[PDB]
Amino acid sequence: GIPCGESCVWIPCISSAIGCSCKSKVCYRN
Numbered sequence: 001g002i003p004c005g006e007s008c009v010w011i012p013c014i015s016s017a018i019g020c021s022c023k024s025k026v027c028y029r030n
Contacts, residue, residue, distance in 0.1 A: 004029045 006013055008022035020027035 001030050002028065 004013065004018060004020040004027040006018075006020075007026040008020075009025040012022050013020045013027040014022075018027070018029075020029045
């Protein structure tokens with residue numbers, strides 16, 4: 001429920017194993 005820092009407009013933050021969810025083209029966590 002808190003922004004991670006990077007966006008996922010083009011590249012999703014999945015193949016990085018950061019543990020963030022792509023939402024509103026931006027990565028969020030907890």
